Design an enzyme around this catalytic site. Structure first.
Site, PDB file in Angstrom:
ATOM      1  N   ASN A 169      11.687   0.522  -4.381  1.00  0.00           N
ATOM      2  CA  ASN A 169      11.245   0.487  -5.773  1.00  0.00           C
ATOM      3  C   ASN A 169      12.107  -0.395  -6.682  1.00  0.00           C
ATOM      4  O   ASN A 169      11.820  -0.508  -7.870  1.00  0.00           O
ATOM      5  CB  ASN A 169      11.142   1.904  -6.336  1.00  0.00           C
ATOM      6  CG  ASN A 169       9.916   2.642  -5.831  1.00  0.00           C
ATOM      7  OD1 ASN A 169       8.878   2.034  -5.563  1.00  0.00           O
ATOM      8  ND2 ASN A 169      10.026   3.962  -5.706  1.00  0.00           N
ATOM      9  N   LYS A 227      -2.996  -2.622  -9.090  1.00  0.00           N
ATOM     10  CA  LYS A 227      -2.761  -1.370  -8.371  1.00  0.00           C
ATOM     11  C   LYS A 227      -3.996  -0.468  -8.414  1.00  0.00           C
ATOM     12  O   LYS A 227      -4.298   0.140  -9.444  1.00  0.00           O
ATOM     13  CB  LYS A 227      -1.554  -0.650  -8.976  1.00  0.00           C
ATOM     14  CG  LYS A 227      -1.108   0.605  -8.242  1.00  0.00           C
ATOM     15  CD  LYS A 227       0.211   1.091  -8.815  1.00  0.00           C
ATOM     16  CE  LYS A 227       0.630   2.437  -8.258  1.00  0.00           C
ATOM     17  NZ  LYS A 227       1.942   2.859  -8.841  1.00  0.00           N
ATOM     18  N   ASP A 250       6.669   1.326  -9.885  1.00  0.00           N
ATOM     19  CA  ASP A 250       6.079   2.583  -9.402  1.00  0.00           C
ATOM     20  C   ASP A 250       6.589   3.806 -10.161  1.00  0.00           C
ATOM     21  O   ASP A 250       7.517   4.483  -9.719  1.00  0.00           O
ATOM     22  CB  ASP A 250       6.298   2.745  -7.889  1.00  0.00           C
ATOM     23  CG  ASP A 250       5.632   4.000  -7.315  1.00  0.00           C
ATOM     24  OD1 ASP A 250       4.834   4.654  -8.023  1.00  0.00           O
ATOM     25  OD2 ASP A 250       5.917   4.332  -6.141  1.00  0.00           O
ATOM     26  N   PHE A 305      -2.012   6.712  -1.687  1.00  0.00           N
ATOM     27  CA  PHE A 305      -3.209   6.776  -2.527  1.00  0.00           C
ATOM     28  C   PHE A 305      -3.377   5.555  -3.438  1.00  0.00           C
ATOM     29  O   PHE A 305      -4.166   5.587  -4.386  1.00  0.00           O
ATOM     30  CB  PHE A 305      -3.177   8.058  -3.370  1.00  0.00           C
ATOM     31  CG  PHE A 305      -3.116   9.323  -2.555  1.00  0.00           C
ATOM     32  CD1 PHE A 305      -4.171   9.675  -1.718  1.00  0.00           C
ATOM     33  CD2 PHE A 305      -2.010  10.164  -2.627  1.00  0.00           C
ATOM     34  CE1 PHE A 305      -4.124  10.840  -0.962  1.00  0.00           C
ATOM     35  CE2 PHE A 305      -1.956  11.333  -1.875  1.00  0.00           C
ATOM     36  CZ  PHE A 305      -3.018  11.672  -1.041  1.00  0.00           C
ATOM     37  N   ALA A 306      -2.655   4.476  -3.144  1.00  0.00           N
ATOM     38  CA  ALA A 306      -2.721   3.269  -3.958  1.00  0.00           C
ATOM     39  C   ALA A 306      -2.525   2.027  -3.106  1.00  0.00           C
ATOM     40  O   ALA A 306      -1.610   1.973  -2.285  1.00  0.00           O
ATOM     41  CB  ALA A 306      -1.683   3.319  -5.060  1.00  0.00           C
ATOM     42  N   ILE A 307      -3.398   1.041  -3.297  1.00  0.00           N
ATOM     43  CA  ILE A 307      -3.251  -0.263  -2.664  1.00  0.00           C
ATOM     44  C   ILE A 307      -3.040  -1.296  -3.779  1.00  0.00           C
ATOM     45  O   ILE A 307      -3.799  -1.334  -4.746  1.00  0.00           O
ATOM     46  CB  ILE A 307      -4.479  -0.594  -1.767  1.00  0.00           C
ATOM     47  CG1 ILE A 307      -4.054  -1.448  -0.570  1.00  0.00           C
ATOM     48  CG2 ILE A 307      -5.591  -1.277  -2.556  1.00  0.00           C
ATOM     49  CD1 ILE A 307      -5.215  -1.974   0.258  1.00  0.00           C
ATOM     50  N   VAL A 308      -1.988  -2.101  -3.655  1.00  0.00           N
ATOM     51  CA  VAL A 308      -1.630  -3.088  -4.677  1.00  0.00           C
ATOM     52  C   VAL A 308      -1.988  -4.499  -4.210  1.00  0.00           C
ATOM     53  O   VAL A 308      -1.398  -5.014  -3.261  1.00  0.00           O
ATOM     54  CB  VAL A 308      -0.120  -3.023  -5.013  1.00  0.00           C
ATOM     55  CG1 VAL A 308       0.256  -4.081  -6.045  1.00  0.00           C
ATOM     56  CG2 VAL A 308       0.254  -1.634  -5.509  1.00  0.00           C
ATOM     57  N   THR A 367      11.051  10.844  -1.675  1.00  0.00           N
ATOM     58  CA  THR A 367      11.453  10.583  -0.304  1.00  0.00           C
ATOM     59  C   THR A 367      12.755  11.339  -0.030  1.00  0.00           C
ATOM     60  O   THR A 367      13.783  11.041  -0.644  1.00  0.00           O
ATOM     61  CB  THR A 367      11.631   9.075  -0.070  1.00  0.00           C
ATOM     62  OG1 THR A 367      10.424   8.395  -0.432  1.00  0.00           O
ATOM     63  CG2 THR A 367      11.943   8.790   1.377  1.00  0.00           C
ATOM     64  N   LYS A 379      14.557   4.388  -5.495  1.00  0.00           N
ATOM     65  CA  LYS A 379      14.902   4.112  -4.106  1.00  0.00           C
ATOM     66  C   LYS A 379      14.746   2.608  -3.859  1.00  0.00           C
ATOM     67  O   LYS A 379      14.006   1.949  -4.584  1.00  0.00           O
ATOM     68  CB  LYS A 379      14.011   4.926  -3.167  1.00  0.00           C
ATOM     69  CG  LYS A 379      12.518   4.818  -3.455  1.00  0.00           C
ATOM     70  CD  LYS A 379      11.687   5.517  -2.391  1.00  0.00           C
ATOM     71  CE  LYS A 379      10.196   5.325  -2.636  1.00  0.00           C
ATOM     72  NZ  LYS A 379       9.362   5.809  -1.490  1.00  0.00           N
ATOM     73  N   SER A 416       0.852  -1.187   0.000  1.00  0.00           N
ATOM     74  CA  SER A 416       0.000   0.000   0.000  1.00  0.00           C
ATOM     75  C   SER A 416       0.889   1.239   0.000  1.00  0.00           C
ATOM     76  O   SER A 416       2.114   1.118  -0.109  1.00  0.00           O
ATOM     77  CB  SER A 416      -0.907  -0.012   1.230  1.00  0.00           C
ATOM     78  OG  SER A 416      -0.132  -0.006   2.415  1.00  0.00           O
TER      79      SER A 416
HETATM   80  N1  LIG Z   1       2.926   1.295  -2.551  1.00  0.00           N
HETATM   81  C1  LIG Z   1       3.887   0.387  -3.152  1.00  0.00           C
HETATM   82  C2  LIG Z   1       3.503  -1.073  -2.934  1.00  0.00           C
HETATM   83  N2  LIG Z   1       4.534  -1.982  -3.413  1.00  0.00           N
HETATM   84  S1  LIG Z   1       4.191  -3.438  -4.007  1.00  0.00           S
HETATM   85  O1  LIG Z   1       2.932  -3.906  -3.502  1.00  0.00           O
HETATM   86  O2  LIG Z   1       5.231  -4.333  -3.581  1.00  0.00           O
HETATM   87  C3  LIG Z   1       4.129  -3.382  -5.607  1.00  0.00           C
HETATM   88  C4  LIG Z   1       4.028  -2.146  -6.248  1.00  0.00           C
HETATM   89  C5  LIG Z   1       3.969  -2.040  -7.637  1.00  0.00           C
HETATM   90  C6  LIG Z   1       4.006  -3.158  -8.463  1.00  0.00           C
HETATM   91  C7  LIG Z   1       4.104  -4.436  -7.928  1.00  0.00           C
HETATM   92  C8  LIG Z   1       4.143  -5.559  -8.745  1.00  0.00           C
HETATM   93  N3  LIG Z   1       4.238  -6.783  -8.204  1.00  0.00           N
HETATM   94  C9  LIG Z   1       4.299  -6.976  -6.876  1.00  0.00           C
HETATM   95  C10 LIG Z   1       4.268  -5.913  -5.976  1.00  0.00           C
HETATM   96  C11 LIG Z   1       4.171  -4.611  -6.458  1.00  0.00           C
END
Ligand SMILES: NCCNS(=O)(=O)c1cccc2cnccc12
Length: 301
Positions: free
Chosen positions: A144, A42, A161, A24-27, A180, A141, A21
């Site tokens: 990411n 996402k 991201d 403003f976005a939950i994945v 960040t 970062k 999460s």
């Molecule tokens: N807010 C960032 C959340 N990061 S995340 O859930 O790990 C995450 C973010 C973006 C793409 C992804 C693709 N596959 C797995 C996980 C992914």
């Protein structure tokens, strides 16, 4: 301009466990019912109007999608499809389930600078593709930098991201404050003109942390962190950098530069002796130089 699918995502996908999460976005982890293949979904919350404290604007969502639709590279996350309802715009992206690069590194028994440069070179390859296309990432970062399958010997890195990414226009000025603090370039903090150069700064920070465990400009407060950056106040304190080669330091030192013109562009960083050794002598030095994994594991865990 391709339109977003208006159907309900749950009528086409089985939604599963939360991957992450943030703001403003939950994945969420998903699977398309028709093909049976797995993806990551996402959910971006849209704004109510404009002052609206909650949500992302239409432009900023359309920008991200526009950018994501252009990119097909092995070190970059790839878009599959885009859905939309009244509240959320849902991006169905490649499932990268190997976690963060640093989490995988934090479990190794040892790590040479050669092994280190492999992972860094993947990040560089990815950023080069973006930069050739005049796309700044603007949020490079450690969290990411994800991995596909950690269970293989040398995992494959995927940049994720692109929420702050931006197409760099010739002649047009672009200034903004985002990201960040710990990882942002001086031109961001100073509200000076931005470009492709900021990503190269952030690779510097990433490399600095990867090799040592310490963060170059991190202070006890956001205030201190921002003052360190703007003055470019860091060192290679021997407590963390006794195992570190001169070339590794040379690389980091040419990236963490205030002047954007004098900073290494991506093509130069790929060609730096630490990434691309010129003789077999310097290739041995890199293979023999080790990273202090406890200093790293301590500042992580
Ligand atoms: N807010 C960032 C959340 N990061 S995340 O859930 O790990 C995450 C973010 C973006 C793409 C992804 C693709 N596959 C797995 C996980 C992914």
């Amino acid at each position: 301009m391709e339109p977003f699918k208006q159907q309900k995502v749950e009528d086409f996908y089985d939604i599963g466990e939360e991957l992450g999460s943030g703001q403003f976005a939950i994945v969420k982890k998903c699977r398309e019912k028709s093909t049976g293949l797995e993806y990551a979904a996402k959910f971006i919350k849209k704004r109510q109007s404009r002052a609206s404290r909650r949500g992302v604007s239409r432009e900023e969502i359309e920008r991200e999608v526009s950018i994501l639709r252009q990119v097909l590279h092995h070190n970059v996350i790839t878009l599959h499809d885009v859905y939309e309802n009244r509240t959320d715009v849902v991006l169905i992206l490649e499932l990268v389930s190997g976690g963060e690069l640093f989490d995988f590194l934090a479990q190794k028994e040892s790590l040479s600078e050669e092994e280190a440069t492999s992972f860094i070179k993947q990040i560089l390859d990815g950023v080069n593709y973006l930069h050739t296309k005049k796309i700044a990432h603007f949020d490079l970062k450690p969290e990411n930098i994800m991995l596909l399958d950690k269970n293989i010997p040398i995992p494959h890195i995927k940049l994720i991201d692109f929420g702050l990414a931006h197409e760099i226009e010739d002649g047009v000025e672009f200034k903004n404050i985002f990201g960040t603090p710990e990882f942002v370039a001086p031109e961001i903090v100073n509200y000076e003109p931005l470009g492709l150069e900021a990503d190269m700064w952030s690779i510097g920070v990433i490399t600095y942390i990867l090799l040592s465990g310490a963060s170059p400009f991190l202070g006890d407060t956001k205030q201190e962190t921002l003052a360190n950056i703007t003055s470019v106040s860091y060192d290679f304190d021997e407590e963390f950098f006794s195992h570190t080669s001169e070339l590794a330091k040379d690389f980091i030192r040419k990236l963490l530069v205030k002047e954007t013109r004098k900073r290494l562009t991506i093509q130069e960083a790929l060609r730096h002796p630490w990434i691309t050794p010129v003789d077999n002598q310097q290739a041995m030095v890199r293979r023999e130089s080790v990273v202090n994994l406890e200093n790293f594991r301590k500042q992580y865990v």
